[PDB]
Amino acid sequence: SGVNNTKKWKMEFDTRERWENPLMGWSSTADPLSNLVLTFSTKEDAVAFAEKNGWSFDVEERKVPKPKSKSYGANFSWNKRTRVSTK
């Protein structure tokens, strides 16, 4: 339920081939850049970071929580069906 992760921007890459080591069943990987993510407060700096080294670039807009119209008396109604069946 905590949200102290939905507040920054990251710099994740595309995953590449991950094969098992013949001896010990590792995850030998030839992608040097796979295990690297940056942290950006806002977004246009994150993109401003993106083009200055010229990486293939796309974004995703922040899925902001819509305001949930909460209530407690709705669970005890007279006509509306929001009467809770257990408490």
């Binding site: 006509n79 009467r83 257990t86």
Partner: protein, 214 residues
């Protein structure tokens, strides 16, 4: 019996043949009419009470049958049954002994009463007689704490009750005769034992202290 999960036993199973006698449908329809339509879940309490006064317990079959006759999901029936005290899901031995054990009663030594029906009847707390007459449980206050340690037998309680008073109460009880409920001593309902103090002069007439039109 201290088991809030239901074991599917061959006797108490959803296949157990529970139903209502012709009078009950008049009784349970009297339950539903007492409340406004739209919210008739209120009847889950007295309908389950009706089964208490017919089967002597609440088999899982009774709760399941209550579900559709109440137009409620079966679990809401279980929740009502499992919480409240004498909604017993387990067979009981004819007469249910509810000895009042809470502090005001034990202060006048409910343990003497508890020891009295313990040794005389010969079964431990929460158990039943070998041939199903008595079941003693150490209940708390039912609402008569002023009197001596209480015993609530089935539906009729016995107050102002002494350990010597308890053995004679169950003396006739095992013979089938029910004793008079209420305070067992000379106290009738709530007057002091050493003579009544209040309620001396006749009550005032019908209507007093008129405030003009009133």
């Amino acid at each position: 019996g201290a088991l809030f999960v239901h074991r599917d036993t061959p006797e108490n199973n959803p296949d157990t043949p529970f139903d209502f006698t012709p009078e009950n449908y008049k009784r349970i329809e009297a339950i539903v009419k007492n409340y406004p339509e739209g919210h008739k879940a209120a009847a889950v309490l007295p309908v389950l009470d009706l089964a208490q006064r017919q089967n002597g317990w609440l088999p899982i079959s009774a709760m399941n049958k209550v579900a559709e006759i109440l137009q409620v999901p079966p679990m809401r029936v279980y929740e009502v049954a499992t919480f409240y005290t004498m909604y017993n899901r387990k067979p009981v031995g004819k007469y249910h002994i509810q000895v009042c054990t809470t502090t005001p009663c034990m202060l006048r030594n409910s343990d003497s009463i508890l020891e009295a029906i313990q040794k005389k009847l010969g079964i431990k707390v929460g158990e039943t007689t070998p041939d199903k007459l008595f079941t003693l449980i150490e209940v708390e206050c039912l609402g008569a704490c002023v009197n001596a340690p209480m015993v609530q037998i089935n539906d009729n309680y016995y107050e102002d009750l002494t350990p010597k008073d308890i053995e004679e109460i169950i003396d006739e009880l095992k013979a089938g005769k029910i004793p008079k409920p209420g305070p067992r001593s000379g106290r009738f309902s709530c007057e002091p034992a050493g003579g009544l103090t209040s309620l001396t002069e006749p009550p005032k007439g019908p209507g007093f202290g008129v405030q003009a039109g009133l």
